[PDB]
Structure formats: structure tokens, C-alpha cells
Symmetry: C2
Subunit: 190 residues, 2 copies
């Protein structure tokens, strides 16, 4: 059935507006992470922004045209240090998966928009992992564990692929001469 | 000391020529992986190409100008299916870390170019992991394990971040509606 005049129609636009802003915020935080010397985290922010772009696209495609007025609150700023940005980002993700999406999904179901409700619920799952990443990285920064660990492990240079074995990433990559900022724990997800 | 007239000078240019070609090949293979429905693998090819760009840059910066003639053999083609491309790529990486770089490093040491020799050796380490990734992915394709595993696990949509729990990736992402091609095993390297 058509969405015209429904609460779900406005909820979709509200979600689209929020996700659009989140995309920008995450890209800015990504740039700041770069300046703060956290390349992996910078790329994580950039990827999250791209994924918010996709959540927004799915939502946008449900709309059927025309200008619609919405009333909603959003983060008025700001760009701080990377740890602070990760904390604020996690809080935003938390709101989305614990409050916004579940509420929007329930209303969608109430109004008879099952497919849309399922999409809202599905997006919430992605947001929960987004929060996890942001919280995990914030914790690594706070504990001084971004580039140094208790036991020896493997570190990979994101710039050239060099693999370093040790308790911590080197000050300079011996292969490409790029700074420690480019290193991450070697990951294998396959 | 200057590199002029040394064998190391020509070895550096030879490595630069090969790495430059590898960058192109990997980008083309990345495009083919996309067409074959392997997004994670496509992005892996693209990242490897970018890293070859960086190995090449480090090498390029050692040179001191002028045109230099080199005699070397390179892969004359070709672009095939993704499994075949992964196999050929791994073979190329194998040559680089087992033959080319170690030989170039030894000669560099022999001619008194210690720093350059260390860089050759360091690049070799990155290439060995490049081969590992290519071989692991080729094996996943051959065994039909790219999108399906024996026990239930977590799969992540690279397009939107949705997380799916099950023995295999879904045909369609319930959040962004993108095809199975976008899924990968959920990874946590932090
Ligand atoms: Fe979001
Ligand atoms: Fe999110
Ligand atoms: Fe490096
Ligand atoms: Fe290479
Ligand atoms: Fe390589
Ligand atoms: Fe998705």
C-alpha cells in the first residue's frame, strides 16, 4: 500500500535525514583520525560513512516524491579529538539501534508496512556492530593499546602490506618508510 | 654512495617496472572479481594494487635520474576467471619474495648498499603475505567455501555492515538488498 500520510513515511525521511548527517560526520571524523595518526581508525570512519550512505539509499528509495516536513533533533557539532569522536559516534549508533530503528519498525508493522519494518530492523543490526567498532577503538586509545599489546603479535602496514612481529608496531615501516600510524593488527577474515 | 653504474641501480628499476605492471594487473583482476561476484576478493585485489604502488614509490625514490635500459621478462597477459587470476597472482608474488627480492637484496649488500638491501628484504615480507591471501582465496573458491562454511558463523555485508548469523551468507542482504557477493566473514582485527 501507499505510504502517503502515514507516520512511517515521515519516519523514513527522518531516518534518511539522520543517516545523511551521520555520513558527513563520520567522514569528518575520518579526516581527523588521519591527522591524529590513526590510519586504521580513519579508514573505519570512512567505511562506516559509506555504509550510512547505503542505509540512506535503501530508505530514500522507499519514498514516493514531494516535499515533507519533519521535526527532529540532531547533533549540532562537533569535531574533537579522535577518542571523543569515537565516543560521540558510538552514542549516535546506540540511539539508532536501541531507540530509533526499533521504534520505527514497530510503527511500520502497526501501519501494515511489513517489508519496511523488516528493513528498519535489519539496519539496526548493522548499527549495533558500528557501535561495537567505535567503542572498541575508543577503548584501545584510552588504554594505549592501539599500537602496543601485552604479548608479541603480528602488525600489518596498511600502506604497503609489510608484516611486523612484536609487542608493538614500529615507529617507521621498514618497507615503505611510512609512520607507525599506518599499522594495524594483522587480520585474517577468510 | 651513488648508485650510478651499479647492478643495484638496474635491479631497482627492474623491480619498479615489475611492480608497476603488477599494480595494473591486480586492478584489472579486481574488476573481474567484481564481475564474478566476489566483492571482498575484488577489494583485496584493489588494496594489493595500491600497496604495489607504494613498494614502487619507495623503489622509484632511490633512483637518481636519466634513462636506463633493462632486460626482464614479464607476464604477457592475461585476464581470466577470478580463481585463475588468484593463482597467477600468487605465482607472481612467489617469484618476488623467493627469487627477485632476495637476490636483489644480496647483490645490494655485495655492492655496499645496505639501506636499499634492507628495503628489498622488507618488501619481500609484504609479498609473502600477499601470496598467502591470494592462495587462501583461491582455495576458498575451489572448495566452494567463499560464502558457505561447515559450522554457523558471522557474515558481514561489506556494502552496509549488516551482520548475518548462519552457515552461509544470504542470497540478498536484508538491510541493503545487495547480493550475496558483498558478504565476507565478520572480521575483528583490533
Ligand atoms: Fe545509521
Ligand atoms: Fe551506523
Ligand atoms: Fe609499509
Ligand atoms: Fe610486488
Ligand atoms: Fe605483492
Ligand atoms: Fe547490506
Amino acid at each position: 500500500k501507499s505510504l502517503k500520510g502515514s507516520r512511517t513515511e515521515k519516519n523514513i525521511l527522518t531516518a534518511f535525514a539522520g543517516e545523511s548527517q551521520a555520513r558527513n560526520r563520520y567522514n569528518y571524523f575520518g579526516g581527523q583520525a588521519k591527522k591524529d595518526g590513526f590510519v586504521q581508525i580513519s579508514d573505519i570512519f570512512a567505511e562506516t560513512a559509506d555504509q550510512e550512505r547505503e542505509h540512506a539509499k535503501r530508505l530514500f528509495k522507499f519514498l514516493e516524491g514531494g516535499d515533507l516536513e519533519i521535526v527532529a533533533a540532531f547533533p549540532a557539532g562537533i569535531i574533537a579529538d579522535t577518542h571523543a569522536n569515537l565516543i560521540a559516534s558510538a552514542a549516535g549508533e546506540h540511539h539508532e539501534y536501541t531507540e530509533m530503528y526499533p521504534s520505527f519498525a514497530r510503527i511500520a508493522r502497526e501501519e501494515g508496512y511489513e517489508e519496511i519494518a523488516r528493513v528498519f530492523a535489519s539496519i539496526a543490526v548493522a548499527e549495533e556492530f558500528h557501535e561495537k567498532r567505535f567503542l572498541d577503538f575508543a577503548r584501545n586509545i584510552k588504554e594505549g593499546r592501539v599500537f602496543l599489546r601485552e604479548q608479541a603479535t603480528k602488525w600489518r602496514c596498511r600502506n604497503c602490506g609489510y608484516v611486523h612481529e612484536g609487542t608493538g608496531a614500529p615507529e617507521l615501516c621498514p618497507a615503505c618508510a611510512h609512520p607507525k600510524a599506518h599499522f594495524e593488527l594483522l587480520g585474517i577474515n577468510w
